[PDB]
Assembly symmetry: C3
Homo-oligomer: 414 residues x 3
């Protein structure tokens, strides 16, 4: 809970919690305040439960895109680092921890998709998407393919579609304009067109998923793939002489991958907000702190400028940061749920031929507002029923509103 | 019974309708136009039924908050008192009778919660909320409690919550901005926290409702309660030496109770709009008009400045007008229905520990703004339902 | 089919498609490119289905209001006629073919309601609505009625209602503000009030529909009726000595009838965008082009200034254009579905006495918006049912294609 006089930290099991515990000991040595690090199962699901009743950890570690939902439910304390501390980190990461004007977390690490290439098949990676078709028929002559990446998930296909001017929601002040959606502009249109052309000219298969794209690259069957820092360990094992580099340009514009930021938030119910802020600002977000965490489990690229420059000596890490700098910070707003489902269908339908490019993307725009507001209404029936639970004396699994009558007037009058 | 050459007035049975008929005989004397006053059952429900077909009274009396829904359905005629008539009343009472720029009703009487205290247990009432925890323990030593009021309805708990900067919807031009909700700001957050602190520090019970809060004050078991002019008649009966005063301040700010304004609206279907406006401006909203109504039933505080000053000699009425002047005029808009159910759940959950202050209020701004889809959904279903039952049968 | 190297044109079967095919042969003579005009059943429903999968015609002919939904679904190619070609047509017709700033089609013909009168019963038609009461009494003495028109649908009753300031959605920049509805203002209030007054003063029956209104005018029972260019051929057969003129003014303001504009849109999937724009701009939208189409089946008033002035020799056509120029261009946006349903009820309720004018209108202004927001949420539940269609199929293409 609160944990008055101490600090309890939740961080996912797959991270460097042992390294974080070691910063905890260093903090315990100069202050006498003991730090407890734990990694419960599905802590991103548990936090919304316990924090709503004033319990839980003092500080939570998760990808920034979950925090928008938390801050909306008032579960995170507004943080106030002064200007001096802010300049210690990359200015773009602060934009990943801002919910409606307010700063609600500290950025730790940075993730983004990169171009991963087989050095032995490709001496040098293309700087340009446009030259991939030419490159594929050069490698096909050797029974090899140029590129294979997951086409089923928008996360992977977005970098291209967004390249010439697409975007999820327009951001211009720490606040996302939810009626300015850019899935239906000329830039996005140009991007998805190129992608569909790649599939229909047989340079790519419409059924390529994560597993198939990973198996092909790790068996040296394909020259290139698009993936993030979590996929590297498997390529090390495959013994593929691989490189990680900046994504290819399209129509002269860099690709725009989604940027996910590991963030540290303070529970709005913690009485140890001061302790937590001193721990994060002066012990963890330091070269010595991140180093200790990194040693246990690599963070990839980090938000702190000083330690990032030390980690950039690895050209894989330097490439993940450079991609992220030219990429699009993933909106933390609830309307993103709609965007995922809409663009998923728009890409799958354009790819298979079921729909055209212009139609698939135009339908997504409508599906964005339609599915997005639906979530607001779904919360209304879910809050009206929830009020009834606490009034009388899984269970909420009800949800009626099934009256959508379609009036079809007979416009005959001849 | 469309009227035509006569005035038929509607007003609730609990009001000075016999005093109103006395002004209606006065009008009949200088005009030869007979005034009929009636008080049918659930008139506030019947009025929208009959007015939508072009029937019912020429003029209607009810709290200003119901008038928003009426004027939205276009059942009220616009009124035009000139600059001279408007300055006879308190400026703020005109803000209660404004529906999207247009004035639709004449303000009559003003209602707000006040601090009612036992003079025999409390010499001077506390000017400050912050000092009540200290006053309770001083009274717990004697087997008494400092304060007990209804914690179940947000009408009673709002004064405190809104004190430091909370508000329902932002008003700034005879028009409410329905996207500017103030249940989740630092003002509301500071207020509700204080209220919950009281409950967990056992200066208050989470299960205190209207009945329990009234019983306790009327048996002298508690030194203070918060209530309105309607409860006065029961405290007289209990023989408690009581006082009515301005509500305590919080963080230096005055408490902000909701303001209910009893108002007179003219039926849009009434052929007697001119007669009505003459009766209301020149006969009823005068010292003698309101007196006649008041002698039948007390209005409490009144909108007319002149007659308010004569009534102000009662310190109970004097405090009601002070509280109402520092309070918030209850929005007349349909989005208020959402506000009631959401803030009500928010306070209940915060008090019982089921949810924190920050969490209950942040999810209150969702429930209240998200119940607006009910407005469009339930109104669109229900709207189309009427046409279904007409086209299909 | 596909289209590559030719043109395929879709137009409704009640138009001059043979005359359109005749423009098609003239094009084929100078170019060699074959033009195939076809008129399939319910083509305005078939077009969204085939155009979404990249099929259908190169060019499509329909009333402009249907194109909003097409351009929203991205089924129409943005057209670019230069300032020189744009000035050959009436400026107001271009506004009927703008979807959110972009031009999506070519204007062909214009259609609006007009006052149609029996010159044997009425020598000179009234310029004023206000005088129809007095005129009725004068004709009632002879066992005739002054005016009889379809009161059931708003399309017909709108001209009056809108006359003094009523409007569907405010339009100011090729873009409709859907929060600015005008069915509740003083203008609309005044118009419907006048209509209600006519019905309760028994100058008009609340149950007059299209069929009753048409029969009455064509049996010489009523002196006047409002209607459009489509009802003319029935009046010719009735042997009624009739005229067609400008609609009566209310409170000194002209009646605002809804403007329907026949339009030519280019499929965004068509490989022959340059061919189609060459056909339309320089072969069809010319004196000789529309003339060939007109001779097969009349277009009524036309968007091209030059040929319109030759057609204006007919006073009927000259008046359809004059009514259209003072009227309101029908919004092409999806919120118009809700507009029709809300105003249809509002009028029927106010006329039957079931509701007052103030109530029935202020209900419509809230109802039309309430259905509009539902419309978006219905293309949602159904669009989530594309998962039912798809996610079931890609599971049966996976359980069935791996035949157990
Ligand atoms: Ca624990
Ligand atoms: Ca500092
Ligand atoms: Ca170092
Ligand atoms: Ca080192
Ligand atoms: Ca390790
Ligand atoms: Ca009666
Ligand atoms: Ca005066
Ligand atoms: Ca004492
Ligand atoms: Ca009495
Ligand atoms: Ca065919
Ligand atoms: Zn664990
Ligand atoms: Zn190729
Ligand atoms: Zn140190
Ligand atoms: Zn009664
Ligand atoms: Zn205490
Ligand atoms: Zn046919
Ligand atoms: Zn008459």
């Amino acid at each position: 809970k609160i944990e008055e006089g101490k600090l309890v930290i939740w961080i996912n099991g797959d991270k460097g919690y042992n390294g974080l515990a070691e910063v905890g000991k260093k903090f315990e040595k100069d202050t006498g305040i003991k730090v407890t690090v734990e990694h419960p199962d599905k802590l991103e699901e548990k936090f919304p439960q316990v924090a709503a009743t004033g319990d839980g950890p003092d500080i939570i570690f998760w990808a920034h895109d979950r925090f928008g939902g938390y801050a909306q439910s008032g579960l995170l304390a507004e943080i106030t680092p002064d200007k001096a501390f802010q300049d210690k980190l990359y200015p773009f990461t602060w934009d990943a921890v801002r919910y409606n004007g307010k700063l609600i977390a500290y950025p730790i690490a940075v993730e983004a998709l990169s171009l991963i290439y087989n050095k032995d098949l490709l001496p040098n990676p293309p700087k340009t998407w446009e030259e991939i078709p030419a490159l594929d028929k050069e490698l096909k002559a050797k029974g090899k393919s140029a590129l294979m990446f997951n086409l089923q998930e928008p996360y992977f296909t977005w970098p291209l579609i967004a390249a010439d001017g697409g975007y999820a929601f327009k951001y211009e002040n720490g606040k996302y304009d939810i009626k300015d959606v850019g899935v239906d502009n000329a830039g996005a249109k140009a991007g998805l067109t190129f992608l569909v052309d790649l599939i229909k000219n047989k340079h790519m298969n419409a059924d390529t998923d994560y597993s198939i794209a990973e198996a092909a690259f790790n068996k040296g069957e394909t020259a290139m793939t698009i993936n993030g820092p979590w996929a590297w360990s498997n390529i090390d094992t495959s013994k593929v002489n691989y490189g990680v580099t900046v994504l290819p340009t399209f129509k002269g514009q860099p690709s725009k991958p989604f940027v996910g930021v590991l963030s540290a938030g303070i529970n709005a119910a913690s009485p140890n907000k001061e302790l937590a802020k001193e721990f994060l600002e002066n012990y963890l977000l330091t070269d010595e702190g991140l180093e200790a965490v990194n040693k246990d489990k690599p963070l990839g690229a980090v938000a702190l400028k000083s330690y990032e420059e030390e980690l950039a000596k690895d050209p894989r890490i330097a490439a993940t940061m450079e991609n992220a700098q030219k990429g699009e910070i993933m909106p933390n707003i609830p309307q993103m749920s709609a965007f995922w489902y809409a663009v998923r269908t728009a890409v799958i339908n354009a790819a298979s031929g079921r729909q055209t490019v212009d139609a698939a993307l135009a339908a997504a725009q409508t599906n964005a507002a339609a599915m997005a507001t639906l979530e607001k209404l779904m919360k209304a029936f879910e809050s009206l029923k929830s009020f009834q639970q606490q009034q009388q004396q899984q269970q909420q699994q009800q949800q009626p509103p099934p009256p959508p009558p379609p009036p079809p007037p007979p416009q005959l009058p001849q």
